[PDB]
Design brief:
The chain is α+β, with helices and mostly antiparallel strands. 35% of the residues lie in helices and 13% in strands. A five-stranded antiparallel beta sheet has the order 5-6-1-8-9, with no helix packed on it. Strands 2, 3, 4, 7 and 10 form a five-stranded antiparallel beta sheet that branches. The protein is globular. The two termini are 46 Å apart. It binds fe (iii) ion. Pfam families: Lipoxygenase, PLAT.
Length: 817
């Protein structure tokens, strides 16, 4: 007999797993039947509870099992398992002793009757397809066929079927015509990454829109369970939209709290004394998992939000021009600023539609610390935050909404000799066309510290940051991380076996991504969901991200390519990373290059363990099918584009894996974990603007003079949507205590290959080394202006490690929140 140990986690006593409850059958990797498929042994049941091993913990139990297995039956390489119990359990592992064979499973096993085919698990060996032991080749391909399913049917909780569909599940046209939304994906008008297929079928009123459902399916093992309810952060979004948001709304409908903030102190009060709300509103929040962690409460009437990092040292520093500019390089959205190499800035928009698009900013009006414009341009000291061409096509329709008004903005920045950025002009642009009923005009606003001009300049920064917050949430964050990554998740499970080296390399970087995305489609980006009800563009929000996706380029997601494309660095082979930054102390980019380099080294060391030559990549059938599908189906609306890597070389494989890991880990961390730390003060990161600048001689103009804080608050996001936005960004900025960070894996035995395990240890050591280096940077007094700023907030977003909570640091493996 072969002595084995099964470790599993009950859904939630242990004796019910005994008798005839659970059977396993070992499968040979070396002895085949007459069809060349590995021989399968007898059904073998769990025989007793193992009590010996202390190294267990975390709700796990271990079971003893002995398999009949003459050396005749060869060496086991897989096993089947059948659960005869009513309730599913979570299978962790099988270990066969005496040399040892390890099976890492980490999968829910439902009752046997629910599966078309018996659950199969492979030993922890790694094989490209041409290396699969012959008796497992068919089992390997059949499991992939199982995972792909057939493209039809309503997916159920226990299904493990990965497939693609368009974003046609956001609208709710059966409820109201007002909730109808365009399908995103699958047309030239609205290209978009695909998402995981759910198959709920058509609405009554629109055969192109998928009907509503209480649960948005993900393949079962994508739906992460948590030992602690407080760690199920993704379910908070659902509770917030479905339960908490209506509770807040009723407090305002009943006039139990003032409808608007009246001064900046009313906002600061949220994390000081708190806000007083009706008892039944407090009573709605307090017992909810995740939500109850968002606020401190007296259990009666008070909710208090946590103090955001951006105000922890100075509550007024956000208002400084130094901090406004610094956050474009070290803030929540540090990846949009561009070099400006000519002046005035140009527009590619059609003047026949929007009016003359010539910039109104004059060079002679700008304070460039004594530099002439030619000098600033030539010394590469001029930059911009350019939302003009992005927003202008949407300004007319946005401004037609009740309580939304925006400009398409452009901000010019000058890189001072001291290495900090300063803002020197903001252009607030509006489209103009012959029939317009509005008399509002485009304006240029310059910095000012006193008088009504200082208030107009503060408002101008707010309009800019409304554009930036919208672009950050929809494009930098949602489109470029969450949405862009999902097609790669699906392709990987459809086409790379669990045995495949590139499966093992990439899948840690997918943890929880399909799950959070599905919950997002249900409650965050749905019609009348959180984003539409809290951000400027309202019902146009998600379609705006489709327009931006038209210009998404996979190879420009690589950090060096991004920096070069935006004109914030230049190619320079004489530097360690091959690029020279044009803003030397650009914290996101300088820290990012270190992480990028570490990932690249890891990928370059792993790949050659499995692919010796370009030919070995061309000839890997799973890899070729994977990449073909990811591009032609997953990102199929951009399959016509010339820039996709072809995947016929070692270099191409490294490039593709490096970009995927980068997007999933560091890029997402840098744009996600700063949300509450910077945006928890709504004045610092307004999500919406509700009026344009006022005309002279109006009461709104006199208000700017007499009550500037009220002028500002009437312009930005109202109090009710503020309470909702703050709550959701608090959730999304939190690290669950069971997170798995870059340099970590959930199991030490993910492969039996010692060289791959060594390479991975080297990678984790390098990240520790990098963190020491980043610590030294933050402690360097010369770098204070950009790494800390007047808010005195050290840039820690790209520190690789973190404890649980709202920590402003730590790089998870994946897009996990
Ligand atoms: Fe995120």
């Amino acid at each position: 007999k072969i002595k084995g140990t099964v470790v599993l986690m009950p859904k939630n006593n242990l004796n019910a797993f005994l008798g005839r409850s659970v059977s396993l059958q070992l499968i040979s990797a070396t002895k085949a039947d007459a069809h060349g498929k590995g021989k399968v042994g007898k059904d073998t049941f769990l025989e007793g509870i193992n009590t010996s091993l202390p190294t267990l913990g975390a709700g796990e139990s271990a079971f003893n099992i002995h398999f009949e297995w003459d050396g005749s039956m060869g060496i086991p390489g897989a096993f089947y398992i059948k659960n005869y119990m009513q309730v599913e359990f979570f299978l962790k592992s099988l270990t066969l002793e005496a040399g040892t064979i390890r099976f890492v499973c980490n999968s829910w096993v439902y009752n046997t009757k629910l599966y078309k085919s018996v659950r199969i698990f492979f030993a922890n060996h790694t094989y490209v397809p041409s290396e699969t032991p012959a008796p497992l080749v068919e089992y390997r391909e059949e499991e992939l066929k199982s995972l792909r399913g057939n493209g039809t049917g309503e997916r159920k909780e226990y299904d493990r079927i990965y497939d693609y569909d368009v974003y046609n599940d956001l609208g709710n046209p059966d409820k109201s015509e007002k909730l109808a939304r365009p399908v995103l994906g699958g047309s030239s008008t609205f290209p978009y990454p695909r998402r995981g297929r759910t198959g709920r079928g058509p609405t009554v009123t629109d055969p192109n829109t998928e009907k509503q459902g209480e649960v948005f399916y993900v393949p079962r093992d994508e739906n992460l369970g948590h030992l602690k309810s407080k760690d199920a952060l993704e379910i908070g979004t659902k509770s917030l939209s479905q339960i908490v948001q209506p509770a807040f709304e009723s407090a305002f409908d009943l006039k139990s709290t003032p409808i608007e903030f009246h001064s900046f102190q009313d906002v600061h009060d949220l994390y000081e004394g708190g806000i007083k709300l009706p008892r039944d509103v407090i009573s709605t929040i307090i017992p909810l998992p995740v939500i109850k962690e968002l606020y401190r409460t007296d259990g009666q009437h008070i909710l208090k939000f946590p103090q955001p990092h951006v105000v922890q040292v100075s509550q007024s520093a956000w208002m400084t021009d130094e901090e406004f500019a610094r956050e474009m390089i070290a803030g929540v959205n540090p990846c949009v600023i561009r070099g400006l190499e000519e002046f005035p800035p140009k527009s590619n928009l059609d003047p026949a539609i929007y009016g003359d698009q010539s910039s109104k900013i004059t060079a002679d009006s700008l304070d460039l610390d004594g530099y002439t414009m030619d000098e600033a341009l030539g010394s590469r000291r001029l930059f911009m935050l350019d939302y003009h061409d992005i927003f202008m096509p949407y300004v007319r329709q946005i401004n037609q909404l009740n309580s939304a008004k925006t400009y398409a903005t452009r901000t010019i920045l000058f890189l001072r000799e001291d290495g900090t950025l300063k803002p020197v002009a903001i252009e607030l642009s509006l489209p103009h066309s012959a029939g317009d009923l509005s008399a509002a005009v485009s304006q240029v606003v310059l910095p000012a510290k006193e008088g009504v001009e200082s208030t107009i300049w503060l408002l101008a920064k707010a309009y800019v940051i409304v554009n930036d917050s919208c672009y950050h949430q929809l494009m930098s964050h949602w489109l470029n991380t969450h949405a862009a990554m999902e097609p790669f998740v699906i392709a990987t499970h459809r086409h790379l076996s669990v045995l495949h080296p590139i499966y093992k390399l990439l899948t840690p970087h997918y943890r929880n991504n399909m799950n959070i995305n599905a919950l997002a489609r249900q409650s965050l980006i749905n019609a009348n969901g959180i984003v539409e009800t809290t951000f400027l563009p309202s019902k146009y929000s998600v379609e705006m991200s489709s327009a931006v996706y038209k210009n998404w380029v996979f190879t420009d997601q690589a950090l060096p390519a991004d920096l070069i494309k935006r004109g914030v660095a230049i190619k320079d082979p004489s530097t360690p990373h091959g690029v020279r930054l044009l803003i030397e102390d650009y914290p996101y980019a300088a820290d990012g290059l270190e992480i990028w380099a570490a990932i690249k080294t890891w990928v370059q060391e792993y790949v050659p363990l499995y692919y010796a030559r370009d030919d070995d990549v061309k000839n890997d059938s799973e890899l070729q099918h994977w990449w073909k599908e990811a591009v032609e189906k997953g990102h199929g609306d951009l399959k016509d584009k010339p820039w996709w890597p072809k995947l016929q070389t070692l270099e191409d494989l490294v490039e593709v894996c490096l970009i995927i890991i980068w997007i999933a880990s560091a890029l997402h961390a840098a744009v996600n974990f700063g949300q509450y730390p910077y945006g928890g003060l709504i004045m610092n990161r307004p999500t919406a603007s509700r009026r344009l600048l006022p005309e002279k001689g109006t009461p709104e103009y006199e208000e700017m003079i007499n009550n500037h804080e009220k002028a500002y608050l009437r312009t930005i996001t109202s109090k009710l949507p503020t309470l909702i936005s703050l709550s959701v960004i608090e959730i999304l900025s939190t690290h669950a205590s069971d997170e798995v960070y870059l340099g970590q894996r959930d199991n030490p035995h993910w492969t039996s290959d010692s060289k791959a395990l060594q390479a991975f240890q080297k990678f984790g050591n390098k990240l520790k080394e990098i963190e020491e280096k980043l610590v030294r940077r933050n402690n360097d007094p010369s770098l204070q202006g950009n790494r800390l700023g007047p808010v005195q907030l050290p840039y820690t977003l790209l520190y690789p490690s973190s404890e649980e909570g709202l920590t402003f640091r730590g790089i998870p493996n994946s897009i996990s929140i």
